[PDB]
Amino acid sequence: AKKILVTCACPYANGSIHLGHMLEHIQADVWVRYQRMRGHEVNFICADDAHGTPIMLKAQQLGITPEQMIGEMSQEHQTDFAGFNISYDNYHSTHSEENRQLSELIYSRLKENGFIKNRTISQLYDPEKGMFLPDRFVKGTCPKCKSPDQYGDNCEVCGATYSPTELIEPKSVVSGATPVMRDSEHFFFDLPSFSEMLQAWTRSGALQEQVANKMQEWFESGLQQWDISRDAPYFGFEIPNAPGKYFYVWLDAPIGYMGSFKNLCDKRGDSVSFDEYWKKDSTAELYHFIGKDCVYFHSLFWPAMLEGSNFRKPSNLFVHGYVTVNGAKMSKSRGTFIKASTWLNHFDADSLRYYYTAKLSSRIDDIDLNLEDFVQRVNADIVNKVVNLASRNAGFINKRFDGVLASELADPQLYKTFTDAAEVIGEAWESREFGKAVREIMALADLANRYVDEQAPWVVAKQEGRDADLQAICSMGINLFRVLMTYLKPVLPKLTERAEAFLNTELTWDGIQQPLLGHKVNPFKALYNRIDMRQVEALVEASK
Ligand SMILES: [Zn+2]
């Protein structure tokens, strides 16, 4: 009965999707699929973050328009996410007319409400190219150790940090020209005006405890005003009444959440839902799934901007940690910086969705993909616990009983144990305690296989006159599989489709209360095959 709008952060248009992105989009997709299974109205929304100086310059280097480049990367991104079955209701772009008009609207409201301040800044400027230089497009000699060819605000030899204006013999990365200091008027959002409002939200208890603690450090340091403008040349939206000025991506990127939802509503011919979700009086819920590096922005700048432009604020932020591989940050030289597209040449989507889900929780903790453990855990849990309950029992049903399951449960007490667990498992999916849910499901899977072991169908099958016993045992195993695959349906969309085809039934959350009795099932080939370390070695080699 709830109306829920769920987002992931917008992937930057100038890089490929990797396993880091996939942790976030899989976490949200599992939660979204569970919310849909419980009958809520869910809108799962994302977009490509497509503006800015790095994109402008990359397109120039490639000799194509930025529009052509971001269109190609947006197609690549959506192809990867579709390969992982991320079930967005809309995937849009920050470079869109919807985002242009909402960025202009929010800015004009911030301005008339007094939250925009004009300030003159000084910044390095490339007079040959004719553009201001972001720090990482300035290179020079480290002032401390005199190492040449250092970029930006830090030296990769001695580790010093400094303003790029302290570099010796500085050079523009764009043109090679010596940069010079130049003044420019910039427009700043007066975030500090919202400190009392933001402090109340922090102590309200909605946010994760680790997030609220970090916010207290940021209030202690003191909130600053934030630049929301950039000088031409730029790839972005021009600021109205301010020729030669553009909105910086800090302003237009989160508005992409709104523009993507407005686009979805407009395509649907829906003229009411946008205001229903975004007006201050909304009874809809708004959730952002984000990583650690986005917390300051989404917990302070974003709700402040919404407040100052008369829109509702997020209901909650759901923050996850970083991905590591074999215990360490992803490493190109070791082949553990793994792209989403590369992953799918070697493994299916369900394997990674399962592994991540088994590790995730409601806390902010880094999530380690140990590749040896990945092989072991997929084989142990998917092939040998859950899929085993179908594969060990379906052959007898199809071959000796014409595909027909028994007319009554062999062990109704055991079946109730499985259906009784729905409340705790569903609450674990609801609360983002994914690892708790998977632990609960796998303990049930152990119990189901112990039941089959105790009944010993490989013995019953060879014994004269025990046909009814065999059909009863195997039908019981299959009904236990029906329940477990319902609990796993948010996690394993493709295996679930194969399970539904075998069972001749859609799996619904409430449907587990009616076991399949006197019911025809279909033959199947292989629901899920083993993986091995040779495939892990191939993936690592391919990613070097
Ligand atoms: Zn140095």
> Are 225 and 290 in the same domain?
yes
Q: Are 141 and 150 in contact (CB under 8 A)?
A: yes
Asked how this structure was determined, the answer is: X-ray
- Going from the Cα of 169 to the center of ligand 1, the distance in angstroms, rounded, reads 14
In a domain, 525, yes or no: no
> Are 59 and 195 in the same domain?
yes
Domains held by the chain: number: 3
Mapped onto helix, strand or coil, the DSSP state of residue 112 is helix
Summarize the annotated binding site for ATP as residue ranges: 332
Summarize the annotated binding site for Zn(2+) as residue ranges: 142, 145, 155, 158
- Going from the Cα of 332 to the center of ligand 1, the distance in angstroms, rounded, reads 24
In a domain, 532, yes or no: no
- Estimate to the nearest angstrom the gap between the alpha carbon of 99 and the chain centroid: 21
**Backbone torsions φ then ψ of 83, nearest 5 degrees:** -65, -20
Mapped onto helix, strand or coil, the DSSP state of residue 530 is coil
- Going from the Cα of 158 to the center of ligand 1, the distance in angstroms, rounded, reads 4
- Going from the Cα of 142 to the center of ligand 1, the distance in angstroms, rounded, reads 5
Residue 474: CATH number of its domain: 1.10.730.10
> Are 492 and 464 in the same domain?
yes
- Going from the Cα of 161 to the center of ligand 1, the distance in angstroms, rounded, reads 8
- Going from the Cα of 172 to the center of ligand 1, the distance in angstroms, rounded, reads 19
- Going from the Cα of 133 to the center of ligand 1, the distance in angstroms, rounded, reads 21
Can you give the length of the chain in residues?
A: 544
* Rg of the chain in Å (alpha carbons): 28
Mapped onto helix, strand or coil, the DSSP state of residue 167 is coil
In a domain, 82, yes or no: yes
Burial category of 108 from C-beta neighbours within 10 Å (exposed 0-12, middle 13-18, buried 19 and up):
middle
Q: Are 371 and 325 in contact (CB under 8 A)?
A: yes
> Are 22 and 97 in the same domain?
yes
Q: Are 252 and 237 in contact (CB under 8 A)?
A: yes
Residue type, 533: M
- Going from the Cα of 167 to the center of ligand 1, the distance in angstroms, rounded, reads 10
- Going from the Cα of 407 to the center of ligand 1, the distance in angstroms, rounded, reads 78
> Are 447 and 352 in the same domain?
yes
Q: Are 540 and 334 in contact (CB under 8 A)?
A: yes
> Are 268 and 401 in the same domain?
no
Q: Are 144 and 158 in contact (CB under 8 A)?
A: yes
Q: Are 524 and 498 in contact (CB under 8 A)?
A: yes
Mapped onto helix, strand or coil, the DSSP state of residue 25 is helix
Mapped onto helix, strand or coil, the DSSP state of residue 461 is coil
In a domain, 463, yes or no: yes
Q: Which element (helix H / strand E) includes 253?
A: helix 249-267
In a domain, 143, yes or no: yes
Mapped onto helix, strand or coil, the DSSP state of residue 161 is strand
Q: Are 132 and 139 in contact (CB under 8 A)?
A: no
Mapped onto helix, strand or coil, the DSSP state of residue 339 is strand
- Going from the Cα of 173 to the center of ligand 1, the distance in angstroms, rounded, reads 19
Q: Using H for helix, E for strand and C for coil, what is the string for 389-427?
A: HHHCCHHHHHHHCCCECCCCCCCHHHHHHHHHCHHHHHH
- Going from the Cα of 154 to the center of ligand 1, the distance in angstroms, rounded, reads 8
Sign of the Cα torsion 475, 493, 263, 272 reads: positive
- Going from the Cα of 490 to the center of ligand 1, the distance in angstroms, rounded, reads 50
Provide the edge-to-edge strand list for the sheet that holds 180-189.
131-132, 116-126, 180-189, 226-227
Q: Copy the structure tokens of residue 113.
A: 């409400």
Provide the edge-to-edge strand list for the sheet that holds 285-291.
90-93, 41-48, 3-8, 285-291, 316-320
Return all residues near 238 (Cβ < 8 A) that are at least 6 apart: 245, 246, 247
- Estimate to the nearest angstrom the gap between the alpha carbon of 443 and the chain centroid: 27
Q: Nearest CA to 512 among 434, 387, 415?
A: 415
CA distance 394 to 388: 10
Q: Resolution of the experimental model in angstroms, please?
A: 1.7
- Going from the Cα of 148 to the center of ligand 1, the distance in angstroms, rounded, reads 8
> Are 17 and 84 in the same domain?
yes
Largest CA distance in the chain: 94
Alpha-carbon distances, residue 383 vs 354, 380, 513 (angstroms) = 12, 6, 25
Q: Are 150 and 167 in contact (CB under 8 A)?
A: yes
Q: What is the DSSP secondary structure assignment for residue 330, as one 8-state letter?
A: -
- Going from the Cα of 184 to the center of ligand 1, the distance in angstroms, rounded, reads 30
CA dihedral 179, 182, 187, 191 (to 10 degrees): 70
- Going from the Cα of 105 to the center of ligand 1, the distance in angstroms, rounded, reads 46
CA distance 431 to 35: 11
> Are 214 and 291 in the same domain?
yes
Summarize the annotated binding site as residue ranges: 142, 145, 155, 158, 332
Q: Copy the structure tokens of residue 499.
A: 């399970």
In a domain, 443, yes or no: yes
Alpha-carbon distances, residue 510 vs 423, 448, 513 (angstroms) = 11, 20, 6
> Are 378 and 459 in the same domain?
yes
Alpha-carbon distances, residue 105 vs 99, 108, 157 (angstroms) = 10, 5, 47
Q: Copy the structure tokens of residue 396.
A: 């007898």
Residue burial 440-457, b: 16+ Cβ < 10 Å; e: rest: bbbebbeebbebbeebeb
> Are 44 and 169 in the same domain?
no
- Going from the Cα of 337 to the center of ligand 1, the distance in angstroms, rounded, reads 28
Q: Nearest CA to 138 among 111, 163, 120, 121?
A: 163
Mapped onto helix, strand or coil, the DSSP state of residue 429 is helix
In a domain, 379, yes or no: yes
> Are 349 and 407 in the same domain?
yes
CA distance 10 to 328: 25
Return all residues near 179 (Cβ < 8 A) that are at least 6 apart: 124, 125, 126, 127, 133, 138, 170, 171, 172
Mapped onto helix, strand or coil, the DSSP state of residue 407 is coil
Alpha-carbon distances, residue 65 vs 59, 70, 238, 243 (angstroms) = 6, 9, 17, 22
Residue 258: CATH number of its domain: 3.40.50.620
- Going from the Cα of 135 to the center of ligand 1, the distance in angstroms, rounded, reads 16
* Residues β-bridged to residue 162: none
CA distance 377 to 386: 12
- Going from the Cα of 157 to the center of ligand 1, the distance in angstroms, rounded, reads 5
Residue type, 30: V
- Going from the Cα of 288 to the center of ligand 1, the distance in angstroms, rounded, reads 40
CB atoms within 10 A of CB 316: 14
CA atoms within 13 A on the CB side of 459: 5
Residue 134: CATH number of its domain: 2.170.220.10
Provide the edge-to-edge strand list for the sheet that holds 150-151.
150-151, 138-141, 168-172
Q: Nearest CA to 246 among 235, 255, 257, 254?
A: 235
Supply the range of the domain harboring residue 265. Answer: 3-113+190-320
Q: What is the DSSP string of 122-171?
A: EEEEETTTTEE--GGGEEEE-TTT--SSEETTB-TTT--B--GGG-EEEE
CB atoms within 10 A of CB 376: 13
- Estimate to the nearest angstrom the gap between the alpha carbon of 285 and the chain centroid: 18
> Are 196 and 311 in the same domain?
yes
- Going from the Cα of 123 to the center of ligand 1, the distance in angstroms, rounded, reads 22
**Backbone torsions φ then ψ of 204, nearest 5 degrees:** -70, -25
Q: What is the DSSP string of 36-88?
A: HHTT-EEEEEEEEB--SHHHHHHHHHHTS-HHHHHHHHHHHHHHHHHHTT---
Q: Based on DSSP, count helices (H) and strands (E) in the chain, helices before strands.
A: 22, 16
Q: Copy the structure tokens of residue 99.
A: 């985002």
- Going from the Cα of 526 to the center of ligand 1, the distance in angstroms, rounded, reads 59
Q: Are 323 and 366 in contact (CB under 8 A)?
A: yes
Q: Are 99 and 249 in contact (CB under 8 A)?
A: no
In a domain, 334, yes or no: no
Q: Nearest CA to 242 among 123, 111, 65, 50?
A: 111
